């Protein structure tokens, strides 16, 4: 059967691009920090970068130290770095190196700038060995992941306007770069999308639709983290027991819907999970599955 953990991914020697996504507030940032820590600890000789594409960044807030537009090592890690894409700065730099304010607040500019960052890595490919993306909630991340296509068409159309309105070299460079990205993003050994959800109707239904959308783009998804589980069958109050009954109802559907996926069940801990120490502690259960009987005390150990 399908191991209920991310060990295969954590030990992958092929993946270059790992997206962590799903509904708002389900634990994308927490999980993406966790996966990254596990990858860096499991593969000491490789360099990892965790990039936030959520315009409302939380990497700094989760680790409790200051990251920004320039990649920077996580304090206490030899081989993990974080970057929080900064649009103001990014556009300020473009303006200097060649308005930048007014386009700096245009809806879509965040996804545009995030993708541009991907393009820079590709061009240096020809660094970090693997990039993990802590993505924006579902709706806007799908727009980002549509970019390779949206973009090749826009560039084609842009070239048509130019022919009519009397440079081809740069369009081709741009198009070639987009193509490399599309090729890599649709290669199962190079990129995967790990979904995060909670065991509730709104999250489950959104996760299924997200996954269908991803598969239709030929993006790989083989892993789902189900977060914030109560495991109240393992001194639990009336509220916890009723809520766990709900969680189990959806967990049963999840087990059937995603029987072909790694389904990784993670506990709600007795506090928020912040700082390297606590994130690492939590992260162990992505590698070796949480067992409520034996590991139960860890949720109080923050």
């Amino acid at each position: 059967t399908v191991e209920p953990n991310l060990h295969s991914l954590i030990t992958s020697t092929t993946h270059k691009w790992i997206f962590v996504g799903g509904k708002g507030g389900v634990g994308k940032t927490t999980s993406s920090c966790s996966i990254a820590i596990q990858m860096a600890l499991s593969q000491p000789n490789k360099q990892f970068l965790l990039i936030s594409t959520d315009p409302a960044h939380n990497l700094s807030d989760a680790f409790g130290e200051k990251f920004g537009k320039d990649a920077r090592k996580v304090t206490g890690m030899n081989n993990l770095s974080c970057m929080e894409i900064d649009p103001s700065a990014a556009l300020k730099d473009m303006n200097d190196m060649a308005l930048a304010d007014l386009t700096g607040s245009i809806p879509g500019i965040d996804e545009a700038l995030s993708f541009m960052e991907v393009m820079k890595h590709i061009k240096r490919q020809e660094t970090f060995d693997t990039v993990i993306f802590d993505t924006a909630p579902t709706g806007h991340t799908l727009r980002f992941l549509q970019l390779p296509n949206t973009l090749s068409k826009l560039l084609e159309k842009f070239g048509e306007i130019t022919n009519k309105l009397g440079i081809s070299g740069k369009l081709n460079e741009l198009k070639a770069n987009v193509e490399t990205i599309r090729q890599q993003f649709t290669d199962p050994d190079l990129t995967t999308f790990v979904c995060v959800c909670i065991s509730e109707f709104l999250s489950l239904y959104e996760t299924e639709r997200l996954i269908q959308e991803l598969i239709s783009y030929d993006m790989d998804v083989n892993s789902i983290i189900v977060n914030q589980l109560l495991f109240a069958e393992n001194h639990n109050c009336k509220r916890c027991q009723a809520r766990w009954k709900m969680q189990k109802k959806y967990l049963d559907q999840i087990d059937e819907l995603y029987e072909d996926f790694h389904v990784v069940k993670m506990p709600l801990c007795a506090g928020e999970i912040r700082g390297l120490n606590n994130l690492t502690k939590f992260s162990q259960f992505l590698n070796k599955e949480y067992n409520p009987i034996t590991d139960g005390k860890v949720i109080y150990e923050l």
Partner: protein, 31 residues
Amino acid sequence: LTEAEKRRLLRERRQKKFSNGGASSRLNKIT
């Protein structure tokens, strides 16, 4: 089953579940 065999099998099974009208069916079973 080898590591590589299991990987290809699951890939195919995951894919098959969304093929044809699989996706639409999955949505209905959720709703």
